[PDB]
Structures are given as structure tokens and as C-alpha cells.
Amino acid sequence: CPLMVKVLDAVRGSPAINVAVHVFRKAADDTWEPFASGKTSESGELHGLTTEEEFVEGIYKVEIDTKSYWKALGISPFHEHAEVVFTANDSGPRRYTIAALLSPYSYSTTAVVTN
Amino acid sequence: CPLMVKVLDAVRGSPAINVAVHVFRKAADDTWEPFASGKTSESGELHGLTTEEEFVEGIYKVEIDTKSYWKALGISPFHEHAEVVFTANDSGPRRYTIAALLSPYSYSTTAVVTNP
Ligand SMILES: O=C(O)c1ccccc1/C=N/OCc1ccccc1C(F)(F)F
């Protein structure tokens, strides 16, 4: 599993469950092509988005639909979604974890790249 | 000044100086149209992007060119940029500050929204 997404809720101190996540890849014509998507599990995690052979070098965008999450909890949010745009680089055997921590008016995101 | 941007560097403990910032507004046809741009000052701040009259209700995107910033320091960072997408003035006109804290493999952003 070369690409994982983990989403946390900073208000409730819990995994952010049932959050929609969309992944896009930049095509040579500078357009976002849909690549993978899913909803976070009860652990706030989304696995199995792609395979090693499909996950090639390129520019990727991970979109986290935070607005619908906060609305379902009855909280007025600021952002439309959280976006994370990065370059996947094949230097060696690498796995990418995109982690996001969510509050109604703020979010943080980090990339953990391991073997 | 209804829209300000402030950018900090978490590695050096300083304002992030000379960072390019681009603001887009979602147009009628679902396309992102250019709205304003600038560079952060020696204080890490960017003011004067727009006026109250031109900053109407809409969906806005603030793109902070973090990659160019880290590269100029010799760091190959993870993100291409930091993007912040939000609806503005949906409840009437407000003053927005978009703040971002940058590290090579991480960033955080928060909005401070005040009523004049
Ligand atoms: O990521 C991971 O492999 C991970 C896996 C399992 C459980 C927790 C984590 C890490 N979750 O990190 C949350 C986060 C995300 C973005 C910025 C800052 C944070 C902080 F809360 F850690 F500060």
C-alpha cells in the first residue's frame, strides 16, 4: 500500500470518520484527472487507494471534504475542503502517508514517507 | 483591508519573506479566475490584495507558493504549494486573515475572521 490517508478531529480528539477523500493526478495537459477516492474508516484511515504499479511519479492532489464533516456535526466551518498537492518521487521503495488534523477554522497536514 | 495573508517559517523561527501568494475566485462557469497576487513582506505579511468593494461573496482560493520558498533555501519540500479554499462574505462583509505555518513536509493554516 503506497498511499494512505489519515484524518483526525481536533475538536473531539478522535479519528475523523466517514470523511470523503478524493485523489487526483496532474495530466500532461495541466488538468486534474480523478485517480482514487473513498471514505475514512472508523480509525480515520483510508487504505487501498492505489497499487505500486499505478502510483507513478507525478503531481498528486488529495482533497479532503472537511466542510461536509463539520456540517454533519453541526459546526460552522471555514474551509470548503482541505487540499494537499505534492510530487511523488521515485528515489527508492517509498510509502506515503498523508495525515491531516482538522478544526473548524484550521487544519494541518503532514507527509510521512517511509520504506 | 478585508483580506490579509501571514506566513511563518517553522524551521527558522521567522516570518516567511518573499513568498508568492495568488488569490483566485470561482467564476460563474466553475472555473478559477485570477483575483489578486503579491509577495509577503519582511514581516511575512501581505496586505492590500483587494478592496471592500471588489471582495464580494464567493468561493476563493489562496495559493501560497511554498515550494519556491523552500527551494530558495536549499530544501526539496513535499508540497507543491499550500492551498486554502473558502467561502467569503456569505454572512455579510468581514475581514479575513489567512495564516500559514510552513515546514518542509508539513504546513498548518488557520483563518481569523473579524467584523469591522
Ligand atoms: O500520521 C500517522 O502516521 C498516524 C497514524 C496513526 C495515528 C496517528 C497518526 C498521526 N497523526 O498526526 C496528526 C497530525 C496530522 C497533521 C498535522 C499534525 C498532526 C499532529 F496531531 F500529529 F500534530
Ligand SMILES: O=C(O)c1ccccc1/C=N/OCc1ccccc1C(F)(F)F
Ligand atoms: O501570524 C500572525 O502574527 C497573525 C496575524 C494575524 C492574525 C493571526 C496571526 C497568527 N496566526 O498564527 C500563526 C500560527 C501560530 C501557531 C501555530 C500555527 C499557526 C498558523 F496559523 F500559521 F497555522
